[PDB]
Amino acid sequence: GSSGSSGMAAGAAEAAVAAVEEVGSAGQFEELLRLKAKSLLVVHFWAPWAPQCAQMNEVMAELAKELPQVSFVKLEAEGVPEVSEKYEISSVPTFLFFKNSQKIDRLDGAHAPELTKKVQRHASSGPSSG
Secondary structure, three states: OOOOOOOOOOOOOOOOOOOOEEEOOHHHHHHHHHHOOOOEEEEEEEOOOOOHHHHHHHHHHHHHHHOOOEEEEEEEOOOOHHHHHHHOOOOOOEEEEEOOOOEEEEEEOOOHHHHHHHHHHHHOOOOOOO
């Protein structure tokens, strides 16, 4: 109960990844929400049956690269019925824009262009604004 920071210590780094994260549990998602609160989180619902999720998945990969300040996470609707229940997500494809641990936007249906639009729109918030 007595210390003197005397400034600030140095021992932390940060990297940049443009890959789609795989969410297979509510904990991971509910947890990330906070972490990726400042940034733009994109929760896409992919299914091992729905063909639409096929192309919708490939498109994401690219985006993630274009927008390094964005977070693309894909969750299994049937894989994790815990989260799907809460939001009652019983349809795919389905994207959920979570900002600051609070849903602000949502895209229903397999839309290649419609998606990018929303992604960029929100993605804006952050560095190099514009």
